[PDB]
Amino acid sequence: VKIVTRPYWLAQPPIVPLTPLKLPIESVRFVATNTPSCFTQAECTFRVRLLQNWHIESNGYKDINYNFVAAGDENIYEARGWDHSCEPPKDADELVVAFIGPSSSNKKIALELIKQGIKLGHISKNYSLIDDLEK
Amino acid sequence: VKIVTRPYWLAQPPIVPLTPLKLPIESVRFVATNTPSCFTQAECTFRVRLLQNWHIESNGYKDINYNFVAAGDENIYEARGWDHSCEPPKDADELVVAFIGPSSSNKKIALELIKQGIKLGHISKNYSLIDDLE
Numbered sequence A: 001v002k003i004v005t006r007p008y009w010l011a012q013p014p015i016v017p018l019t020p021l022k023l024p025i026e027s028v029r030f031v032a033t034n035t036p037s038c039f040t041q042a043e044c045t046f047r048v049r050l051l052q053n054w055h056i057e058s059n060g061y062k063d064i065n066y067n068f069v070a071a072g073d074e075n076i077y078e079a080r081g082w083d084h085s086c087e088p089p090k091d092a093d094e095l096v097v098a099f100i101g102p103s104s105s106n107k108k109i110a111l112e113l114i115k116q117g118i119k120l121g122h123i124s125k126n127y128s129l130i131d132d133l134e135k
Numbered sequence B: 001v002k003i004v005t006r007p008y009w010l011a012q013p014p015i016v017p018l019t020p021l022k023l024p025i026e027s028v029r030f031v032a033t034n035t036p037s038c039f040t041q042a043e044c045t046f047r048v049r050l051l052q053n054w055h056i057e058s059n060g061y062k063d064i065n066y067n068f069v070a071a072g073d074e075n076i077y078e079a080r081g082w083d084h085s086c087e088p089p090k091d092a093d094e095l096v097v098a099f100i101g102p103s104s105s106n107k108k109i110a111l112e113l114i115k116q117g118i119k120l121g122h123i124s125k126n127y128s129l130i131d132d133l134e
């Protein structure tokens, strides 16, 4: 799976340091961002930057409040990543994968990411998948 | 343990994507950098930037070829970090911790990092410690 890391989408650092996530992760959650779809890396990159700015400045979060973001360009964007927890109202012990324009396509990509996470020991073999994409 | 993350030492990104590191890590290796000691974060940041440039440009590595760097300013610098393995001749399953001006000071902080890694599930409770400092 192709991950667009933080530097490649011009991420700013967390405004203050994030809290470490205990591994292996035992719960994964798929959520919808309910922001405009995007279909190229340039377009999706721009959207992720905006998401981060909004989460930090408008919401008062320390950083973009997901671990990863699947987008319409079929890329996974690194958000808080494997090792740091999201903050409330998200669960600190879940890997949160957000979706910009959820679809059959990027859902399969996100599932591939989970499979890799399991193989690499980031995600427990005994994990729960919480699919909130319909809401 | 205070970790100076990549953005805070002005790291460039890997030249190309790195290989993922499997967890839990079963082996930690201590290696010497053979670079001048540094005693302030300003000075150590400069040294770590220089190490990364050296590894990428002179050695042809994709990125600084350590996971963490322990320095004389008593800081740990995030290099490849928890998630990505070092490339050859380093082992793809080890956590490589480099030392700038290796000392009893450096070692204590490095051991704290390991203890933190174990608590967080990054490192096996039964990890091997490979000492390449000499």
Ligand code: NA
Pocket: B057, B058
């Ligand atoms: Na050279």
